[PDB]
């Protein structure tokens, strides 16, 4: 049994809700929240900008030190950093950004990072300002992630479309 409330069950391991990921993290304090990161961990906008704002910029300060030591992530890659006031840990995952011309096949590699964590609160990778089709992102999630994932969808309209169209 866990804390997550109000989710629709899509599969054995994937659950979805129309919710503010920031507000959901604040309520649940999950072990892992996933950030929709870029390779520079520059949390300007989208999910990343919202998560970082909710940490009062402490996520960005920590991320800048991580990059200064380790250099950029790979597209499809991840790192584990603090969850600050939102979660125990934040898994920063880089999905491909279609608005930069990145290979959408890297979306599966991105979701494979979730399998290193038994339970996660996450957004749909490469959705929103990363330019991918969220329906496709949900399909790759279901077909890749084997651990228990609780997906938060920002738009109510999009949430309803993802549920109605789910095979």
Ligand X SMILES: O=c1[nH]c2cc(Cl)ccc2o1
Dihedral of CA 129/78/88/13: which sign? positive
Contact region for ligand X (CB under 6 A) — 18-26, 87-95, 109-117, 141-149?
Answer: 18-26
Least distance in Å: CB of 157 to ligand X?
Answer: 12
CB 145 within 8 A of CB 61: no
* Closest residue by beta carbon to ligand X: 128
**Rounded distance, CA 33 to CA 35, Å?**
7
Sites for ligand X among residues 32-61 (CB under 6 A): 46-47, 50
How many helices (H) and strands (E) the chain has is answered by: 6, 7
Least distance in Å: CB of 130 to ligand X?
Answer: 8
CB 7 within 8 A of CB 150: yes
Q: Are strands 119-122 and 148-153 parallel, antiparallel or unpaired?
A: parallel
Least distance in Å: CB of 152 to ligand X?
Answer: 7
Sites for ligand X among residues 97-126 (CB under 6 A): none
* 128 sits near ligand X (criterion: CB under 6 A): yes
> Based on CB atoms, which residue is closest to ligand X, 25 or 75?
25
Question: Residue from 10, 14, 21, 93 that binds ligand X (CB under 6 A)?
Answer: 21
* 138 sits near ligand X (criterion: CB under 6 A): no
DSSP 99-118: GGT--TTHHHHHHHGGGGSS
> Based on CB atoms, which residue is closest to ligand X, 23 or 143?
23
Structure tokens at 63: 């991320």
Structure tokens at 56: 């009062």
> Based on CB atoms, which residue is closest to ligand X, 15 or 65?
15
Which residues of the chain form contacts with ligand X (CB under 6 A)?
Answer: 20-22, 46-47, 50, 127-128, 154
């Amino acid at each position: 049994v866990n804390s997550f409330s109000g989710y629709l069950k899509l599969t054995d391991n994937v659950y979805i809700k129309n919710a503010d990921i920031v507000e959901e993290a604040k309520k649940v304090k999950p072990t892992v929240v996933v950030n929709a990161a870029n390779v520079y961990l520059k949390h300007g906008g989208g999910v990343a900008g919202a998560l970082n704002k909710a940490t009062n910029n402490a996520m960005q300060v920590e991320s800048d030190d991580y990059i200064a030591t380790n250099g950029p992530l790979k597209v499809g890659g991840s790192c584990v950093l603090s969850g600050h006031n939102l979660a125990k840990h934040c898994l920063h995952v880089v999905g491909p950004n279609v608005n930069k011309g990145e290979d959408i096949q890297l979306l599966k590699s991105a979701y494979e990072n979730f399998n290193q964590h038994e339970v996660l609160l996450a957004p749909l990778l490469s959705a929103g300002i990363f330019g991918a089709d969220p329906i496709h992102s949900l399909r790759v999630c279901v077909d890749t992630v084997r651990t228990n994932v609780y997906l938060a969808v920002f738009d109510k309209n999009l949430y309803d479309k993802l549920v109605s169209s789910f095979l």
